[PDB]
Design a protein around this ligand. Structure first.
Ligand SMILES: CC(=O)NC[C@H]1CC[N@H+](Cc2cc(Oc3cnc(N4CC[NH+](CCC(=O)[O-])CC4)nc3)nc(-c3cc(Cl)cc(Cl)c3)c2)CC1
Ligand SMILES: [Ca+2]
Ligand SMILES: [Ca+2]
Ligand SMILES: [Ca+2]
Ligand SMILES: [Cl-]
Ligand code: NA
Ligand code: NA
Ligand code: NA
Ligand code: NA
Length: 473
């Protein structure tokens, strides 16, 4: 009964559907009746060609703004180089019109789509805050494919206004259910970048996404880190297919690439899920992703089983998004209990790092208090330390259930002597575990150099609830 789209380039959208299983299971969500109707997504990028023949029918001025020129119209700036085309490509991934004889289709081909023109100029904290905080009671999902430089030597995150915009978004946005911020984990793979050094993807408020190639491999541009939640397909080598979407100047492209093309596909899957249950909160959406994502046939040398029986990787998080499973589980989902936060200051004195430092601490996770957590969501190790060559450090955190999260891998290009100033390294790998018991922090100098420094603060911050657990996998 469900008729698949007839768009000319739809058969080339290999990642949406097919008889092989190398796809995001989007046609199963469309067949259940979910195509994005009533959901509003906004792309935070270099602008959106609102008059594109495959975007105009779904374009929403209420989901759009131009923060670079301070006006409501996010039309890109046209140049000979076609420099401002990325937002239009991302918009088509989410919501390109279906059955109109043009290009392919979006994952949520009936959703409303807009864009914030924010990257075609100087990106300041105010520019970021005004983009993240745009029309929060109209826009449901924000998709951002970029962040601090992916040079493998930067440590940066949202400054005060942008962090306040995330707080306001998840707390009061979407009628109090919370704005959904979808983020790409980064394109710094060739520079050996480690994505927990990017405070936007490392945030608990962003649902972070990495990439897999068509043949199920970790692409050259992928960044590994413990803050990633899940994966979508994107580009790989020149024998693997790429993303097919709308392009600038009313064109179609078959060569959209990078993790920056994975985040919009996740935003479209999240739009289908929100149509299936409009009452899902920002945390319910992250729980659905953890429970339904699929590791099968994704190749990595770090797949590990966590404390509740789920496989998790630093390259893929919980695995590939599965749109059919997401929309099926959303329908009767019971809203998670309010978020609890348990703060544990670990050190009794500063500790010399040297070649290797291990800090062990047994915690009760706020036993006997309103913030008692027996079911973890995100965990952070907020560290303050000095070190002469930052990139030589590797940091791991082991949970009481034995789950080893790499908080920071060695970054050869990071020569900074600035250390970390209360940097909140985050892991999603212990989701649903009981955080009571022994936690172990390991900081090691991965080089033969006689490096030196001191760890002056280690705060373990646990987020979660004390109810609603599933029987382990
Ligand atoms: C103390 C204080 O005030 N500090 C202020 C700083 C301000 C900076 N931030 C860090 C920071 C930098 C940053 O820089 C970018 C500029 N441009 C591009 N790009 C993408 C490739 N494009 C080409 C694509 C193609 O052609 O294919 C060309 C254009 N990407 C990144 N973008 C962001 C950011 C923020 C949000 Cl919210 C949404 C999105 Cl998306 C991104 C954040 C940290 C705080
Ligand atoms: Ca404008
Ligand atoms: Ca189309
Ligand atoms: Ca990065
Ligand atoms: Cl908080
Ligand atoms: Na910073
Ligand atoms: Na995140
Ligand atoms: Na384990
Ligand atoms: Na325990």
């Amino acid at each position: 009964v469900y008729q698949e789209p007839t768009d000319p380039k739809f058969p080339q959208q290999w990642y949406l559907s097919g008889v092989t299983q190398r796809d995001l299971n989007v046609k199963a969500a469309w067949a259940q009746g979910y195509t994005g109707h009533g959901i509003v997504v906004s792309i935070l990028d270099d602008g959106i060609e609102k008059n594109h023949p495959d975007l105009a029918g779904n374009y929403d001025p209420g989901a759009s703004f131009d923060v670079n020129d301070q006006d409501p119209d996010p039309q890109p700036r046209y140049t000979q180089m076609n420099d401002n085309r990325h937002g239009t490509r991302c918009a088509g991934e989410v919501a390109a019109v279906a059955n109109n004889g043009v290009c392919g289709v979006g994952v949520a081909y009936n959703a409303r789509i807009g864009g914030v023109r924010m990257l075609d100029g100087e990106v300041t904290d105010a520019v970021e805050a005004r983009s993240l905080g745009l029309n929060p009671n109209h826009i449901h999902i924000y998709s951002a494919s970029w962040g601090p430089e992916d040079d493998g030597k930067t440590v940066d995150g949202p400054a005060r206004l942008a962090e306040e915009a995330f707080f306001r978004g998840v707390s009061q946005g979407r009628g109090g259910l919370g704005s959904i911020f979808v983020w790409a984990s980064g394109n710094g793979g060739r520079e050996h970048d480690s994505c927990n050094c990017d405070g936007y993807t490392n945030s608990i408020y962003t649902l972070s996404i990495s990439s897999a190639t068509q043949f199920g491999n970790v692409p050259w541009y992928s960044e590994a880190c413990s803050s990633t939640l899940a994966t979508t397909y994107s580009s790989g080598n020149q024998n693997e297919k790429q993303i097919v979407t709308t392009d600038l100047r009313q064109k179609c492209t078959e060569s959209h690439t990078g993790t920056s093309a994975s985040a919009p596909l996740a935003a479209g899957i999240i739009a289908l899920t929100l149509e299936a249950n409009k009452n899902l909160t920002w945390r319910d959406m992250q729980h659905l992703v953890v429970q339904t994502s699929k590791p099968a046939h994704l190749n990595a040398n770090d797949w590990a089983t966590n404390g509740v029986g789920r496989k998790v990787s630093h390259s893929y998080g919980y695995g590939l998004l599965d749109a059919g499973a997401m929309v099926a589980l959303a329908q009767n989902w019971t809203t998670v209990a309010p978020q609890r936060k348990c703060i544990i200051d670990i050190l009794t004195e500063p500790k010399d790092i040297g070649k290797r430092l291990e800090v062990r601490k047994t915690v009760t996770a706020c036993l006997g208090e309103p913030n008692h957590i027996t079911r973890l969501e995100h965990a952070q190790a907020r560290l303050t330390l000095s070190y002469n060559r930052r990139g030589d450090l590797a940091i791991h955190l082991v949970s009481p259930m034995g789950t080893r999260s790499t908080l920071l891998a060695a970054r050869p290009h990071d020569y900074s002597a600035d250390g970390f100033n209360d940097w909140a390294f985050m892991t999603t790998h212990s989701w649903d575990e009981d955080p009571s018991g022994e936690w172990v922090l390991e900081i090691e100098n991965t080089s033969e150099a006689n490096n030196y420094g001191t760890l002056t603060k280690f705060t373990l911050v646990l987020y979660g609830t004390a109810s609603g657990s599933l029987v382990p996998r």
